[PDB]
Symmetry: D2
C-alpha cells in the first residue's frame, strides 16, 4: 500500500563490542520510521493531537522482528514503511530495512511487523481507540 521511505546512518555509538548494530537501536529507528510515516502522511504532531482530540500517539501492543544480516557504523540504512492492515482499534505497520552493497545490490538487513494502536491517556490509564476515519483516509 502507501509506503514511506526514510534513511538511517549507523553510528559507532549504535554498535556493540562485537562490532555490529546493537538490536535495540533497530527498534529506535522503527519507532522513528513509524511516526515518520504518519507525519509524512499528513497527520499532525502528537503534541497537537493530544490537545485537539486527546490522541497521545500510537502505542505498540505487538511485534515480530527478524534480523537477516548484520550492519555496522557507516552503513546507511533504508527503511520502507507501510500499513499492512487496518483492523478495528489496531493496525499493522510493516517496515523493511535494507542496505546497499557497493555493487548497487540491495540486501535485506531486517524486517518487522508491529501492531499498534491510536491511544488516549484517561488520566494515568492508557486506552486504545478505534482507528480514526480521517486518519485512514490520509494514509490512503
Amino acid at each position: 500500500a502507501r509506503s514511506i521511505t526514510m534513511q538511517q546512518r549507523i553510528e559507532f555509538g549504535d554498535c556493540n563490542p562485537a562490532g555490529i548494530v546493537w538490536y535495540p537501536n533497530y527498534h529506535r529507528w522503527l519507532d522513528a520510521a513509524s511516526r515518520n510515516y504518519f507525519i509524512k502522511c499528513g497527520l499532525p504532531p502528537w503534541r497537537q493531537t493530544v490537545v485537539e482530540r486527546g490522541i497521545v500517539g500510537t502505542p505498540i501492543v505487538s511485534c515480530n522482528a527478524s534480523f537477516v544480516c548484520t550492519a555496522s557504523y557507516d552503513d546507511v540504512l533504508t527503511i520502507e514503511t507501510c500499513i499492512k492492515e487496518w483492523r478495528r482499534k489496531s493496525f499493522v505497520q510493516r517496515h523493511s530495512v535494507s542496505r546497499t552493497t557497493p555493487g548497487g545490490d540491495v540486501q535485506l538487513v531486517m524486517r518487522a511487523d508491529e501492531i499498534r494502536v491510536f491511544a488516549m491517556n484517561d488520566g494515568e490509564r492508557l486506552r486504545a481507540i478505534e482507528v480514526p476515519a480521517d486518519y485512514i483516509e490520509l494514509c490512503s
Copy 2:
C-alpha cells in the same frame, strides 16, 4: 526449565512524552537479562570466550514481543528468563516481565521469545555455531 530472575528499575529517562516506558528500553533490558542468564549459569564473559574459543556472544535472529500493560518510572520490573528450547544452532530464550501492584498482586507487563544463537566473527563475517555441549549442560 532453569529460570533466572533479575529486577529492573524504570528511570525517568526510559519514558517518553506520553509518560510510559519507551519500548526499545524493554529490548535493552531483555538483552541484559539474556546475558545475565548465561552468566549466572556459569558461562564466562564474552570477553573471555572470544579468546578461548572465539565466541563473541549470542546474536538475536528472531523475536516475538508482546506488551500487556504499561509501566513508568519508579516501577520496579521483574524479569524471568529461561531457555524454552534448544535447537541445533539456535535456542529459544523466553523472558517474562512483570510488576507489582501495592496490593502484592503481580501484573504481567510484557513478554518475549527471542531466538538467538552462539556466534563467531570470521573476520568481518558473523557466523553461527552449533550450540556448545558444555553450554547446554551448565544451563541445565
Copy 3:
C-alpha cells in the same frame, strides 16, 4: 553535605566496539542518580509535583564532566551524589563514580558537576524557579 549512594551495573549494551562504556551512558546514569537523590530525600515524584505545584522536574543548564579511567560490562559502579551548592534558581549537583578492584581498592572512574534547576512548563516554554524552600530542607 547530604550524600546519596546508588550502584550501577555495566551491560554489554552500554559498551562500544572499543569495548568500554560508551559515554552517553554515564549521563544516563547521572540523570538517574540525580533524581534518585531527591527521591531518597523525600521529594515526591515529578508526576505528582507537576500536579501539585507545577514542577516538572530539574533540567540541566550546565555540566563539567571528567573521565578518569575506563569501565566495561560487568563492572559495578558506585555513584555518590550530593548537593554542592544552592544558588538562587540553581544548584550544584555532584556525582562521583567509582569501581572496585578485586583488591578491595576503589578507583575513581568519572566525576561530574551538573548545574540544574527546578522548573515549570508555562505551556511550551520551560522556565526556571527559585529553589523551593521546603525542598532545601528535605535535602538537608
Copy 4:
C-alpha cells in the same frame, strides 16, 4: 578553523516526559558529529585504523557542556564541529548546536567543548597517543 556541519532530527524517542530532548541524547549526537568530523576530513574508519596502526578511536577525557534553550521532536538540529586546539596527546573539539525558528532565525540550543585523544588498546588497557601528524594535516 576547519569546520564540519551535520544535521540531526529530533525524534519522539529522544524526549522525556517533560517533552523535551533528554540530555544524554545530545552527547550521542556529539559523539556522532565528532566522528563525522574526522571522517569528512579524510581519516579512515576506526575499523581500519585499528588494523593499520592500532588506533581504536578517540576517547573523551573531558567535557564542558551548556544547554541554552530547549528542543523537541521534529526540530531539526544543526551541529557545527571544529578543532579548537591541538595539544600534545589531546585536542579540543567544539561543537555548536542550533535550530531554526520559522522566522529564519537561528537559535543556539547547546554547546560543548570536548577534550579527546587518539588511543590504542594495549590489551585491556586504553592508552593515549600523541596526536598523529598526518591526522593534523588532513584536519587542516
